[PDB]
């Protein structure tokens, strides 16, 4: 009688640096993204998150907005530089914000899902080497343990890391994200130290044995298609799939990095950080996997260089990111996990959404028909996965509100709510009204 059971979680998602603002208030010190956004050329028009959506001050209005939409769960991240603004220096004023935020959520019948690390590493940690320094495993563990102990009565659903592919390859090899290095060997070591840090938090979590509490990780996953049936394009797709997906799925769920990628990367950089003890910590059993899904890739062999597959445009509709709208890959990825990696383990879609050219019309509305249709198509694939026996427990739309989209600044709008940054006014887009109906009727 319901396409989505009463227990299924309809959610929305944000991240601390993208929405909070108050970047210099109540003891917060700089993150690597405060620093990166002030470096010339790194972020669109030198945008930064000084103010962002001002959610730090407006959170009660924002929670009331979610309650009026019927939101059942809220995924947010916790800012390490508010909690430990200096090495070993706990900031109770920072913790107090997340207590009042999550108290507000619970009292409005919204389940909190907390991401421990969503890219806002404290500058003091980066100045000590950051994710390249294996000591970060202990700093991150201390941070995670403090969150579990102070917030365990408030939060029962924990995500260690958001999108470690971005924190490693996009931040240290491609250089689009903070701290902006361009060195394959560095990105590979960072990927390992991120996974090891995840493992340390899971070890700490299990030792605490918090009542009715669950822990997972969030991975951005795609599906890779070869442009043709040629052997050249088949190898290109295998490499692209190993680079985005298997480099993280295999150590987490198989306890081994993908050997084809170890050998491939080993032609270009050191891969000597791999060892049995570390992979045992990395692959500890999780309670759930969070999947961030946006698009697929169609790839053709390049010129035998490092990770140089040519991106093919198959001619279909795209978002303002240039990302193909291809909802079938949401189902294909969830099924792949069910058949190859996670089996019967609970899955959540921890992000899915789209950037379009949103305008407030003279009627004061945002008629984002393309986002309505985008979300409709993807929720229909989530329903199809459920009806084929998939263990999907919830779905978080990225994002609750328009926000600071990293190197794009405020120029890309992902919200189901529009933000007028001059006034910080929130305007429900038509997609928010559609989602409110989906939650109320549980029908699609």
What residues make contact with Na ion under the rule CB under 5 A? 17, 20-21, 37-38, 46, 48-49, 52, 214, 285-288, 326-328, 346
Beta carbon of residue 280, minimum distance to Na ion (angstroms, whole number): 13
In the complex with Na ion, the residue whose CB is nearer, 49 or 258, is 49
Answer yes or no: are the C-beta atoms of 444 and 379 closer than 8 Å: yes
Beta bridge partners of 290: 218, 348
Query: Does the active-site annotation cover 317?
Result: no
Output DSSP code: residue 180: -
Which of 20, 72, 104, 351 is the catalytic position?
A: 351
Beta bridge partners of 418: 427
Beta carbon of residue 393, minimum distance to Na ion (angstroms, whole number): 7
Burial of 156 (0-12, 13-18, 19+ CB in 10 A): middle
Q: At which residue do the structure tokens 């590979």 appear?
A: 188
Q: At which residue do the structure tokens 């030792």 appear?
A: 207
Query: Does the active-site annotation cover 135?
Result: no
Answer yes or no: are the C-beta atoms of 334 and 392 closer than 8 Å: yes
- Cβ neighbours, 10 Å, residue 91: 18
Beta carbon of residue 302, minimum distance to Na ion (angstroms, whole number): 25
In the complex with Na ion, the residue whose CB is nearer, 184 or 297, is 297
- Cβ neighbours, 10 Å, residue 329: 22
- Long-range Cβ contacts of 41-44 (<8 Å, 24+ apart): 42/178, 42/180, 42/407, 43/406, 43/407, 43/408, 43/409, 44/407, 44/408, 44/409, 44/410, 44/411
- 339: tokens are 């058949």
Beta carbon of residue 401, minimum distance to Na ion (angstroms, whole number): 12
In the complex with Na ion, the residue whose CB is nearer, 98 or 265, is 98
In the complex with Na ion, the residue whose CB is nearer, 302 or 346, is 346
In the complex with Na ion, the residue whose CB is nearer, 152 or 346, is 346
The answer to whether 367 is a known ligand-binding residue is: no
Beta carbon of residue 184, minimum distance to Na ion (angstroms, whole number): 28
316 φ/ψ sector (left φ>0, alpha ψ -120 to 50, else beta) = beta
The answer to whether 259 is a known ligand-binding residue is: no
The answer to whether 377 is a known ligand-binding residue is: no
Beta carbon of residue 288, minimum distance to Na ion (angstroms, whole number): 4
Output DSSP code: residue 318: B
In the complex with Na ion, the residue whose CB is nearer, 130 or 199, is 199
Q: Which of 84, 150, 73 is nearest to 120 (CA)?
A: 84
The answer to whether 406 is a known ligand-binding residue is: yes
Which of 72, 163, 186, 324 is the catalytic position?
A: 163
The answer to whether 405 is a known ligand-binding residue is: yes
- 271: tokens are 């891969």
The answer to whether 408 is a known ligand-binding residue is: no
Where does the chain break, by residue before each gap (C–N > 2.5 Å)? Answer: none
Q: Residues annotated as binding site?
A: 18, 118, 162, 294, 398, 405-406
Catalytic residues: 163, 351
Q: Residues annotated as binding site for substrate?
A: 18, 118, 162, 294, 398, 405-406
């Amino acid at each position: 009688m319901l396409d989505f059971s009463k227990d299924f979680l309809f959610g929305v998602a944000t991240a601390s640096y993208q929405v909070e603002g108050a970047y210099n208030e109540d003891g917060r010190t700089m993150s690597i993204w405060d620093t990166f956004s002030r470096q010339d050329g790194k972020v669109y028009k030198s945008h930064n998150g000084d103010v962002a959506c001002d959610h730090y001050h407006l959170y009660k209005d924002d929670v009331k907005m979610m309650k009026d939409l019927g939101i059942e769960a809220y995924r947010f991240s916790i800012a390490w530089p508010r909690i430990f603004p200096a090495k070993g220096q706990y900031n109770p004023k920072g913790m107090d914000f997340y207590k009042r935020l999550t108290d507000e959520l619970l009292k409005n019948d919204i389940k909190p899902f907390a991401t421990i690390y969503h890219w806002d590493l404290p500058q003091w940690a980066d100045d000590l080497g950051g994710w390249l320094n294996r000591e970060i495993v202990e700093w991150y563990g201390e941070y995670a343990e403090k969150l579990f102990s102070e917030l365990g009565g408030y939060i029962k659903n924990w995500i260690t890391l958001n999108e470690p592919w971005c924190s490693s390859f996009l931040s240290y090899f491609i250089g689009e994200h903070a701290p902006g290095h361009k060195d394959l060997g560095e990105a590979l070591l960072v990927s390992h130290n991120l996974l090891l840090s995840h493992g340390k938090a899971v070890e700490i979590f299990r030792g605490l044995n918090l009542d009715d509490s669950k822990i997972g990780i969030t991975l951005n996953l795609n599906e890779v298609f070869p442009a043709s049936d040629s052997d050249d394009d088949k190898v290109a797709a295998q490499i692209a799939d190993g680079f985005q997906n298997r480099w993280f799925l295999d150590p987490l769920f198989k306890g081994k990095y993908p050997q084809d990628m170890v050998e491939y990367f080993g032609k270009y950089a050191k891969v000597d950080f791999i060892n049995d003890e570390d992979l045992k910590l990395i692959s500890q059993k999780l309670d759930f996997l969070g999947v961030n899904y946006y698009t697929r890739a169609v790839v053709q062999k390049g010129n035998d260089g490092l990770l140089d597959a040519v991106q093919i445009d198959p001619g279909n509709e795209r978002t303002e990111m240039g990302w193909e709208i291809y909802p079938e890959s949401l189902y294909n990825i969830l099924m792949r996990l069910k058949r190859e990696y996670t089996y019967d383990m609970p899955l959540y879609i921890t992000e899915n959404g789209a950037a379009f050219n949103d305008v407030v019309e003279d009627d004061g509305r945002v008629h984002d028909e393309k986002r309505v249709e985008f979300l409709k198509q993807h929720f229909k694939e989530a329903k199809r996965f459920l009806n084929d026996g998939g263990n999907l427990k919830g779905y978080f739309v990225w994002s609750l509100m328009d926000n600071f989209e990293w190197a794009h600044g405020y120029s890309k709008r992902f919200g189901i709510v529009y933000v007028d940054y001059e006034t910080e006014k929130r305007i429900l887009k038509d997609s928010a009204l559609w989602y409110k109906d989906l939650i109320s009727t549980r029908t699609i």
